[PDB]
Amino acid sequence: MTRVLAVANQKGGVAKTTTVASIGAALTEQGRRVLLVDLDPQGCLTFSLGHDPDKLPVSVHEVLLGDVEPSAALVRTDEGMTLLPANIDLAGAEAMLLMRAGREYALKRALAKLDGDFDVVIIDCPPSLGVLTLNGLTAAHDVIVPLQCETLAHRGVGQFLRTISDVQQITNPDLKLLGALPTLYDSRTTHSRDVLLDVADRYELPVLAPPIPRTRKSKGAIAYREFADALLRHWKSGRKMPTFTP
Numbered sequence: 322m323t324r325v326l327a328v329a330n331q332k333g334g335v336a337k338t339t340t341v342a343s344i345g346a347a348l349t350e351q352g353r354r355v356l357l358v359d360l361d362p363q364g365c366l367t368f369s370l371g372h373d374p375d376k377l378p379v380s381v382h383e384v385l386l387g388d389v390e391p392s393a394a395l396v397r398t399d400e401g402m403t404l405l406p407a408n409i410d411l412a413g414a415e416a417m418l419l420m421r422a423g424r425e426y427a428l429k430r431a432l433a434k435l436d437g438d439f440d441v442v443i444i445d446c447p448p449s450l451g452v453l454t455l456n457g458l459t460a461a462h463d464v465i466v467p468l469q470c471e472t473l474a475h476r477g478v479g480q481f482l483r484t485i486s487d488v489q490q491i492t493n494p495d496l497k498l499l500g501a502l503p504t505l506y507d508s509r510t511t512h513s514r515d516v517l518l519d520v521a522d523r524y525e526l527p528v529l530a531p532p533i534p535r536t537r538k539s540k541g542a543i544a545y546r547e548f549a550d551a552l553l554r555h556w557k558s559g560r561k562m563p564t565f566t567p
């Protein structure tokens with residue numbers, strides 16, 4: 322049973338890409354066959370895993386258009402994860418997909434061609450609420466929102482939840498919002514805690530545990546492995562994701 326996890330937040334700089342790669346690595350160490358999908362035309366995930374996006378002969382762009390089979394675009398990573406990479410060509414997807422029926426299902430259609438090949442698919446969405454993020458949410462079974470807790474600035478959470486609700490109404494009724502993964506947690510003061518409590522109070526959004534601290538045997542890596550183990554057990558036995566605050 323392939324599990325597809327979308328990692329989404331229209332706010333940039335909240336450690337989405339780091340989260341995708343780090344959860345991917347932790348799951349791989351636990352024996353899962355992991356595919357990572359880069360849906361950001363800027364190619365941050367792709368670059369971070371050792372591939373120059375500008376030099377890829379093809380990418381997820383051609384895969385979303387149906388011009389290249391998904392298997393043909395996959396590349397390898399040093400840690401064993403498989404990558405469906407991105408480059409700047411993907412910025413053109415919007416103009417080209419808008420002209421076609423079912424633009425929201427392009428990634429879903431692509432992953433269907435790979436089903437059974439991976440235990441876990443993790444999708445790194447760009448910092449936007451356009452067709453690429455919609456493709457990520459439409460293809461996923463679960464979604465988490467990496468959520469910075471350095472500052473109280475969270476005015477985008479409301480529109481993000483509206484987007485989840487719209488997807489559930491129209492393109493993906495089975496999408497489950499697992500919750501927010503706190504990122505950039507600062508242990509120096511109680512401020513990050515207070516930020517998370519304010520978010521938990523104001524928004525219909527579970528705040529998950531543990532927080533990822535601002536940074537193999539590092540505290541950030543330990544927190545990612547702890548969160549990845551929580552994901553595993555949720556998918557294995559239906560255990561509810563532990564929460565930062567009830």
Ligand SMILES: Nc1ncnc2c1ncn2[C@@H]1O[C@H](COP(=O)(O)OP(=O)(O)O)[C@@H](O)[C@H]1O
Nearest residue numbers: 333334335336337338339340365534535536541
């Ligand atoms: N735990 C952390 N501690 C310190 N810096 C981090 C941490 N996680 C991510 N960063 C940095 O934050 C910046 C944005 O991270 P990134 O994963 O690219 O976020 P996003 O994908 O949401 O834009 C990057 O420079 C990254 O190196």
Ligand SMILES: [Mg+2]
Nearest residue numbers: 337338361365
């Ligand atoms: Mg990113």
